[PDB]
Design a protein around this motif. Structure first.
Motif, PDB file in Angstrom:
ATOM      1  N   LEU A   1     -60.225 -45.223  20.705  1.00  0.00           N
ATOM      2  CA  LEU A   1     -59.848 -44.029  21.452  1.00  0.00           C
ATOM      3  C   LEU A   1     -59.001 -43.078  20.609  1.00  0.00           C
ATOM      4  CD1 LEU A   1     -60.535 -46.243  23.696  1.00  0.00           C
ATOM      5  CD2 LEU A   1     -59.132 -44.815  25.199  1.00  0.00           C
ATOM      6  N   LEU A   2     -58.800 -41.877  21.140  1.00  0.00           N
ATOM      7  CA  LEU A   2     -58.025 -40.827  20.485  1.00  0.00           C
ATOM      8  C   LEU A   2     -57.211 -40.118  21.558  1.00  0.00           C
ATOM      9  CD1 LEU A   2     -60.869 -39.491  18.228  1.00  0.00           C
ATOM     10  CD2 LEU A   2     -58.767 -40.403  17.358  1.00  0.00           C
ATOM     11  N   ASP A   3     -55.967 -40.539  21.735  1.00  0.00           N
ATOM     12  CA  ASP A   3     -55.072 -39.820  22.620  1.00  0.00           C
ATOM     13  C   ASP A   3     -54.485 -38.642  21.866  1.00  0.00           C
ATOM     14  OD1 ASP A   3     -55.495 -41.541  24.736  1.00  0.00           O
ATOM     15  OD2 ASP A   3     -53.875 -42.885  24.109  1.00  0.00           O
ATOM     16  N   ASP A   4     -54.162 -37.582  22.602  1.00  0.00           N
ATOM     17  CA  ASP A   4     -53.950 -36.261  22.011  1.00  0.00           C
ATOM     18  C   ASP A   4     -52.576 -35.727  22.398  1.00  0.00           C
ATOM     19  OD1 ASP A   4     -54.766 -36.234  24.618  1.00  0.00           O
ATOM     20  OD2 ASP A   4     -56.028 -34.450  24.430  1.00  0.00           O
ATOM     21  N   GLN A   5     -51.578 -36.060  21.584  1.00  0.00           N
ATOM     22  CA  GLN A   5     -50.364 -35.267  21.433  1.00  0.00           C
ATOM     23  C   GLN A   5     -49.586 -35.143  22.747  1.00  0.00           C
ATOM     24  OE1 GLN A   5     -49.845 -31.607  22.349  1.00  0.00           O
ATOM     25  NE2 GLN A   5     -47.922 -31.508  21.200  1.00  0.00           N
ATOM     26  N   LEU A   6     -49.818 -36.044  23.705  1.00  0.00           N
ATOM     27  CA  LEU A   6     -48.934 -36.157  24.857  1.00  0.00           C
ATOM     28  C   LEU A   6     -47.727 -37.032  24.567  1.00  0.00           C
ATOM     29  CD1 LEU A   6     -50.434 -38.514  27.608  1.00  0.00           C
ATOM     30  CD2 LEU A   6     -51.059 -38.633  25.194  1.00  0.00           C
ATOM     31  N   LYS A   7     -47.612 -37.551  23.342  1.00  0.00           N
ATOM     32  CA  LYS A   7     -46.463 -38.365  22.975  1.00  0.00           C
ATOM     33  C   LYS A   7     -45.170 -37.592  23.146  1.00  0.00           C
ATOM     34  CE  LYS A   7     -46.819 -40.725  19.166  1.00  0.00           C
ATOM     35  NZ  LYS A   7     -46.084 -41.820  19.849  1.00  0.00           N
ATOM     36  N   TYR A   8     -45.203 -36.275  22.948  1.00  0.00           N
ATOM     37  CA  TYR A   8     -44.038 -35.477  23.289  1.00  0.00           C
ATOM     38  C   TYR A   8     -43.713 -35.606  24.772  1.00  0.00           C
ATOM     39  CZ  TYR A   8     -44.834 -32.953  18.800  1.00  0.00           C
ATOM     40  OH  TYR A   8     -45.026 -32.590  17.487  1.00  0.00           O
ATOM     41  N   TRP A   9     -44.629 -35.191  25.644  1.00  0.00           N
ATOM     42  CA  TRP A   9     -44.278 -34.977  27.047  1.00  0.00           C
ATOM     43  C   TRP A   9     -44.180 -36.236  27.904  1.00  0.00           C
ATOM     44  CZ3 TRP A   9     -47.367 -31.574  24.367  1.00  0.00           C
ATOM     45  CH2 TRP A   9     -46.916 -30.251  24.293  1.00  0.00           C
ATOM     46  N   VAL A  10     -44.467 -37.441  27.394  1.00  0.00           N
ATOM     47  CA  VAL A  10     -44.264 -38.644  28.209  1.00  0.00           C
ATOM     48  C   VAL A  10     -43.349 -39.661  27.533  1.00  0.00           C
ATOM     49  CG1 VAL A  10     -45.381 -40.357  29.672  1.00  0.00           C
ATOM     50  CG2 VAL A  10     -46.611 -38.256  29.031  1.00  0.00           C
ATOM     51  N   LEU A  11     -43.687 -40.080  26.311  1.00  0.00           N
ATOM     52  CA  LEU A  11     -42.968 -41.198  25.702  1.00  0.00           C
ATOM     53  C   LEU A  11     -41.500 -40.857  25.488  1.00  0.00           C
ATOM     54  CD1 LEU A  11     -45.258 -42.712  22.884  1.00  0.00           C
ATOM     55  CD2 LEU A  11     -44.199 -43.972  24.745  1.00  0.00           C
ATOM     56  N   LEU A  12     -41.244 -39.655  24.974  1.00  0.00           N
ATOM     57  CA  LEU A  12     -39.859 -39.233  24.803  1.00  0.00           C
ATOM     58  C   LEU A  12     -39.192 -39.050  26.150  1.00  0.00           C
ATOM     59  CD1 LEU A  12     -39.448 -36.715  21.810  1.00  0.00           C
ATOM     60  CD2 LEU A  12     -38.760 -39.102  21.879  1.00  0.00           C
ATOM     61  N   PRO A  13     -39.772 -38.340  27.122  1.00  0.00           N
ATOM     62  CA  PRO A  13     -39.107 -38.256  28.424  1.00  0.00           C
ATOM     63  C   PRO A  13     -38.855 -39.601  29.052  1.00  0.00           C
ATOM     64  CG  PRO A  13     -40.640 -36.504  28.293  1.00  0.00           C
ATOM     65  CD  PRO A  13     -40.749 -37.252  26.983  1.00  0.00           C
ATOM     66  N   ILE A  14     -39.729 -40.581  28.857  1.00  0.00           N
ATOM     67  CA  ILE A  14     -39.503 -41.874  29.492  1.00  0.00           C
ATOM     68  C   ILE A  14     -38.275 -42.553  28.899  1.00  0.00           C
ATOM     69  CG2 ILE A  14     -40.425 -44.205  29.769  1.00  0.00           C
ATOM     70  CD1 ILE A  14     -41.704 -42.555  31.774  1.00  0.00           C
ATOM     71  N   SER A  15     -38.198 -42.634  27.568  1.00  0.00           N
ATOM     72  CA  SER A  15     -36.980 -43.206  26.994  1.00  0.00           C
ATOM     73  C   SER A  15     -35.757 -42.345  27.287  1.00  0.00           C
ATOM     74  CB  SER A  15     -37.137 -43.385  25.487  1.00  0.00           C
ATOM     75  OG  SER A  15     -37.150 -42.125  24.839  1.00  0.00           O
ATOM     76  N   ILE A  16     -35.912 -41.024  27.247  1.00  0.00           N
ATOM     77  CA  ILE A  16     -34.777 -40.132  27.438  1.00  0.00           C
ATOM     78  C   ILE A  16     -34.223 -40.283  28.846  1.00  0.00           C
ATOM     79  CG2 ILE A  16     -34.204 -37.677  27.716  1.00  0.00           C
ATOM     80  CD1 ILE A  16     -34.040 -38.256  24.882  1.00  0.00           C
ATOM     81  N   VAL A  17     -35.106 -40.298  29.844  1.00  0.00           N
ATOM     82  CA  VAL A  17     -34.627 -40.383  31.211  1.00  0.00           C
ATOM     83  C   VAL A  17     -34.027 -41.753  31.463  1.00  0.00           C
ATOM     84  CG1 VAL A  17     -36.209 -38.563  32.001  1.00  0.00           C
ATOM     85  CG2 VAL A  17     -36.897 -40.978  32.239  1.00  0.00           C
ATOM     86  N   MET A  18     -34.580 -42.816  30.870  1.00  0.00           N
ATOM     87  CA  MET A  18     -33.930 -44.113  31.040  1.00  0.00           C
ATOM     88  C   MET A  18     -32.519 -44.101  30.472  1.00  0.00           C
ATOM     89  SD  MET A  18     -36.056 -45.784  32.908  1.00  0.00           S
ATOM     90  CE  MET A  18     -36.054 -44.128  33.568  1.00  0.00           C
ATOM     91  N   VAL A  19     -32.340 -43.482  29.304  1.00  0.00           N
ATOM     92  CA  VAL A  19     -31.014 -43.417  28.692  1.00  0.00           C
ATOM     93  C   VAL A  19     -30.052 -42.645  29.586  1.00  0.00           C
ATOM     94  CG1 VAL A  19     -29.738 -42.350  26.786  1.00  0.00           C
ATOM     95  CG2 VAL A  19     -31.689 -43.794  26.322  1.00  0.00           C
ATOM     96  N   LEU A  20     -30.455 -41.450  30.016  1.00  0.00           N
ATOM     97  CA  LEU A  20     -29.545 -40.651  30.827  1.00  0.00           C
ATOM     98  C   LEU A  20     -29.319 -41.298  32.182  1.00  0.00           C
ATOM     99  CD1 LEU A  20     -30.177 -38.578  28.539  1.00  0.00           C
ATOM    100  CD2 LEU A  20     -29.838 -36.828  30.291  1.00  0.00           C
ATOM    101  N   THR A  21     -30.358 -41.871  32.780  1.00  0.00           N
ATOM    102  CA  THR A  21     -30.239 -42.391  34.132  1.00  0.00           C
ATOM    103  C   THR A  21     -29.306 -43.588  34.153  1.00  0.00           C
ATOM    104  OG1 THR A  21     -32.279 -43.644  33.797  1.00  0.00           O
ATOM    105  CG2 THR A  21     -32.440 -41.532  35.006  1.00  0.00           C
ATOM    106  N   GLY A  22     -29.420 -44.479  33.168  1.00  0.00           N
ATOM    107  CA  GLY A  22     -28.475 -45.579  33.092  1.00  0.00           C
ATOM    108  C   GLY A  22     -27.054 -45.142  32.792  1.00  0.00           C
ATOM    109  N   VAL A  23     -26.878 -44.217  31.845  1.00  0.00           N
ATOM    110  CA  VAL A  23     -25.533 -43.723  31.554  1.00  0.00           C
ATOM    111  C   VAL A  23     -24.915 -43.100  32.801  1.00  0.00           C
ATOM    112  CG1 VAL A  23     -24.303 -41.893  30.309  1.00  0.00           C
ATOM    113  CG2 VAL A  23     -25.789 -43.463  29.078  1.00  0.00           C
TER     114      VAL A  23
END
Ligand SMILES: *[C@@H]1O[C@H](CO)[C@@H](O)[C@H](O)[C@H]1NC(C)=O
Ligand SMILES: *[C@@H]1O[C@H](CO)[C@@H](O)[C@H](O)[C@H]1NC(C)=O
Ligand SMILES: *[C@@H]1O[C@H](CO)[C@@H](O)[C@H](O)[C@H]1NC(C)=O
Lengths: 198, 681
Positions: free
Chosen positions: A1-23
């Motif tokens: 497969l070839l996923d297309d450049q959504l790594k910005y809009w999901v993977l980073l927000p997922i880790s980012i929101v977990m970090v902020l939400t826990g803090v």
């Protein structure tokens, strides 16, 4: 497969929101718990409470090194005496949130071989039936996040009755502590010290 | 999903072919009727505003052109074998009246007589002459080409039409080229694909540092690079039924990339001479072959030559890429081995079909020999055939709820076919080993088939679907699915151990399948079926259908589940499958599936569906080549690979900012408040 450049809009927000939400969770939980006093009640009840605490610590602290002074106390004693919400609230709500906004993708490739029934649950977004063992949808990355995130919180830096009869119960313990245990100190200290510091 | 990219992604061309008759209209006087592309059973009749390329409507009517005449206007047509006649209204193609008793009247259509009235071309340049006072008004240069004036209207909404070149056609008004048309593309037989594409250690450390630091010293969502990276940008080389090759762009709405004329006078087949996708060989109907150099520049005919025997050719079958062989079947049923060029035991089996039978053929020692034969008997007639398309392998077995496995049947040497026999009224289905001739399966249906409606067969990964029309259940279209399993027992790999067994098909010691079959009830009559693909056979294989009306529709593979259940006995029946969609024989039509949402797409009597793979595996190209050309980007499951066209990224970003601001609110507050209040310093 070839996923297309959504790594910005999901993977980073997922880790980012977990970090902020826990803090935020640690800040919110710390805010919610405030004593700010023991009480504002009359003098006497805390006063004899700390007397009771003096008896309690005499059980542990003063009941060891007082071979001569053991008995002298006991006369005095008898006369003087007589979050689960933090689990439920954030993470269940954001399970709904992620399934609401992030669905129907194959987001990444886990490195490890799961078994088939793992591949049953994780890909509810996609409607293929023989896709593969390894590929996973968006919600699986969340499923990996929650259990793996303790180092992140460390590395950013974060850290953690009856009024009278019970008195009689600890008076019974005052009776028990007379000869329940007379601890062997002020006798063996010469033996212990000569056993050490050489 | 559709409203955003409704006409943007769908890409239709309408072709009429070389005109034969053109008749002015009774009303809307800037409008005519266009008659074109005769065929022995029918012809193309359409209505058209002359002042554009705007076709108003089209129809295929079952009459040779000569029957089509004016009244004594009302465009009368009369069958000649019988006495059947149709009176159709010119403006809106209403069938004014029908009869078999007698034709109302006829008037054979008049010839042009344009010269001596309105036409003079004297200084290599045209002049329109008034009949009296021949002042030579509205004069116009002859272009490099000129064959004819098709039509000319002198009235207030003036219009003139020229057959300038063989395939280019120019509309004019008061001279000014007003519009342009091209009808070289009217019938394509065979097709091919061309894609486009972009364009010790210690020293390695520093040269990497220098080049990347020069690199090192916001989104902007540009579309053009996305297209080429996923393979959407492609050149389609189409071969016409006439002699013409040309490159059509898969993007930019099929602007003609380039057009080459042959001299072969009808085209049959296309082949890339090697995998490089640089040099084609193209076969004549007459028995020549051409070798053509495809370049970013216009092509060049790098060779023309005869075949070994100048005989008429029926078809060509592609033999090996590496060995550079081809098999040619001539009418008169003569087979020729073809060693074309260098392109600057080890048996091969090749298999061909006729309505008389299915034959099979084997090549050895630079010769072809018949290997067996299977003809149907006199009364019988083979009807529909398909082979096994090769498949890249993902899963050797279909699983069950309790992690149990049924081992779908993977034998590569299979074809399937139909037999229809009159008076028996027995559609017989066979699933034949295409090598040996053993049948392995019989399935008849004495369900009163028709034999007059189309029937067709497609061969899937481990499953076959063929469809027919019949009455005895109900007069309705019928899809029949058969699914081939190694063992119907819930957990059994029957004789498929592969460590070193190395089974022989030629001998016939192979396993034989068991099968399970079901059928379904379908609203509309099905002309033709095929299968979507990508490079890897990953997604649901998304059966594509082409209907009688011209409409296309895809339905997923999963709705067609043999071993489905009628859904009373499925309810926590743990053994069945993971989320087994039920059997549900009644498949209602869902307009959301349909491609060509409001397009007409007249595909003509003989058309083909093909599935062109792309990258970006959620998406696949399916193309309808034939009388009209059409393609699309199609998603079996809905798009899972593409990120989206339609995120609410602004909502996501703002919610993240809400998190940051609430941090800014509480952190000084809560840290000061709680630490200093609980310490009571
Ligand atoms: C007929 O075609 C012409 C050419 O484009 C167009 O301008 C005109 O509007 C059409 N007729 C109608 C009724 O729209
Ligand atoms: C007229 O009708 C007959 C009846 O079937 C048919 O065979 C014939 O083809 C029709 N005429 C033409 C020109 O097709
Ligand atoms: C007819 O031929 C000319 C000359 O090759 C070329 O421009 C084109 O193929 C046709 N021209 C027009 C105006 O249709």
């Amino acid at each position: 497969l070839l996923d297309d450049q959504l790594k910005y809009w999901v993977l980073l927000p997922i880790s980012i929101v977990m970090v902020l939400t826990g803090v935020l969770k640690q800040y919110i939980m710390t805010l919610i718990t405030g004593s700010s006093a023991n009480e504002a009640q009359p003098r006497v009840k805390l006063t004899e409470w700390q007397y009771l605490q003096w008896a309690q610590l005499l059980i542990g602290n003063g009941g060891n090194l007082s071979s001569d002074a053991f008995a002298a106390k006991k006369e005095f004693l008898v006369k003087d005496l007589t979050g689960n919400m933090a689990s439920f609230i954030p993470q269940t709500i954001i399970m709904w949130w992620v399934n609401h906004f992030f669905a129907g993708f194959i987001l990444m490739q886990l490195p490890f071989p799961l078994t088939a029934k793992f591949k049953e649950m994780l890909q509810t977004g996609i409607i293929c039936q023989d896709l593969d063992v390894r590929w996973v949808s968006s919600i699986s990355w969340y499923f990996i996040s929650v259990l793996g995130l303790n180092p992140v919180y460390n590395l950013i830096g974060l850290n953690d009755p009856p009024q009278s009869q019970v008195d009689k119960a600890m008076h019974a313990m005052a009776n028990d502590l007379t000869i329940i245990q007379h601890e062997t100190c002020l006798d063996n200290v010469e033996q212990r010290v000569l056993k050490q510091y050489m | 999903v559709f409203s955003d990219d409704a006409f943007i992604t769908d890409w239709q061309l309408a072709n009429l072919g070389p005109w034969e008759k053109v008749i002015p209209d009774s009303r809307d006087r800037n409008r005519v009727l266009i008659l074109s592309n005769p065929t022995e059973t029918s012809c193309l009749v359409s209505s058209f505003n002359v002042s554009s390329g705007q076709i108003l409507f089209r129809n295929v009517l079952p009459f040779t052109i000569d029957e089509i005449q004016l009244d004594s206007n009302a465009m009368v047509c009369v069958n000649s074998s019988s006495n059947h006649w149709q009176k159709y209204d010119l403006h809106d193609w209403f069938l004014l009246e029908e009869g078999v008793d007698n034709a109302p009247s006829t008037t054979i259509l008049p010839q042009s007589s344009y010269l001596n009235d309105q036409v003079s071309i004297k200084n290599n340049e045209l002049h329109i002459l008034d009949e009296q006072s021949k002042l030579a008004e509205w004069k116009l240069e002859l272009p490099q080409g000129f064959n004819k004036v098709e039509y000319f209207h002198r009235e207030d909404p003036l219009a003139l039409v020229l057959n300038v070149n063989d395939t280019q056609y120019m509309g004019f008004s008061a001279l000014i080229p007003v519009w342009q048309r091209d009808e070289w593309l009217t019938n394509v037989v065979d097709y091919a694909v061309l894609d486009v594409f972009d364009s010790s250690l210690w020293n390695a450390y520093w040269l990497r540092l220098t080049t990347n630091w020069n690199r090192l010293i916001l989104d902007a969502k540009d579309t053009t690079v996305s297209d080429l990276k996923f393979g959407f940008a492609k050149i389609l080389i189409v071969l016409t039924h006439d002699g013409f090759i040309g490159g059509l762009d898969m993007v930019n709405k099929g602007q003609l990339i380039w057009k080459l004329d042959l001299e072969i006078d009808q085209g049959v087949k296309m082949f890339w001479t090697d995998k490089n996708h640089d040099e084609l060989v193209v076969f004549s109907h007459d028995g020549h072959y051409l070798t053509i150099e495809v370049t970013k520049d216009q092509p060049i005919i790098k060779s023309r030559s005869p075949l070994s025997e100048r005989k008429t050719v029926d078809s060509v079958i592609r033999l090996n890429e590496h060995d550079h062989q081809y098999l040619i079947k001539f009418e008169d049923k003569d087979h020729l081995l073809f060693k074309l060029n260098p392109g600057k035991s080890s048996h091969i089996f090749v298999t061909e079909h006729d309505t008389n039978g299915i034959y099979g053929y084997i090549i050895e020692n630079d010769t072809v020999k018949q290997t067996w034969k299977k003809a149907v008997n006199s009364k019988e007639k083979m009807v529909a055939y398909s082979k096994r398309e090769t498949t890249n392998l993902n899963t050797l077995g279909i699983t069950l709820g309790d992690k149990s496995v049924l081992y779908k049947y993977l034998y590569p040497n299979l074809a399937a076919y139909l037999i229809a026999n009159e008076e028996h009224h027995t559609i017989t289905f066979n699933l034949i080993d295409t090598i040996t001739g053993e049948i392995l399966i019989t399935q008849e249906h004495k369900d009163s088939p028709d034999f007059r409606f189309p029937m067709d067969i497609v061969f899937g990964e481990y499953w076959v679907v063929y469809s027919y029309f019949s009455s005895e259940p109900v007069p309705e279209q019928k899809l029949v699915v058969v699914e081939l399993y190694e063992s119907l027992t819930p957990d059994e790999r029957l004789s498929n151990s592969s460590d070193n067994f190395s089974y022989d098909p030629l001998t016939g010691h192979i396993n034989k399948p068991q099968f399970q079959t079901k059928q379904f009830i379908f609203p509309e009559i099905i002309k033709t079926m095929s299968i979507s693909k990508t490079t890897d056979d990953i997604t649901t294989k998304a059966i594509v259908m082409e209907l009688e009306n011209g409409q296309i529709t895809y339905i997923p593979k999963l709705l067609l589940n043999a071993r489905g259940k009628p859904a009373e006995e499925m309810a926590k029946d743990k053994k069945k499958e993971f989320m087994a969609t039920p059997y549900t024989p009644v498949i209602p039509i869902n307009d959301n599936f349909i491609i060509t949402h409001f397009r007409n797409l007249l595909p003509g009597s003989d058309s083909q569906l093909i599935s062109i793979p792309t990258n970006l595996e959620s998406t696949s190209i399916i193309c309808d080549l034939g009388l009209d050309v059409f393609c699309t980007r199609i998603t079996p499951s809905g798009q899972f690979d593409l990120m989206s066209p339609t995120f609410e990224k602004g909502k996501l970003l703002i919610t993240i900012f809400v998190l940051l601001v609430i941090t800014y609110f509480i952190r000084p507050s809560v840290s000061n408040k709680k630490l200093k209040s609980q310490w009571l310093i």
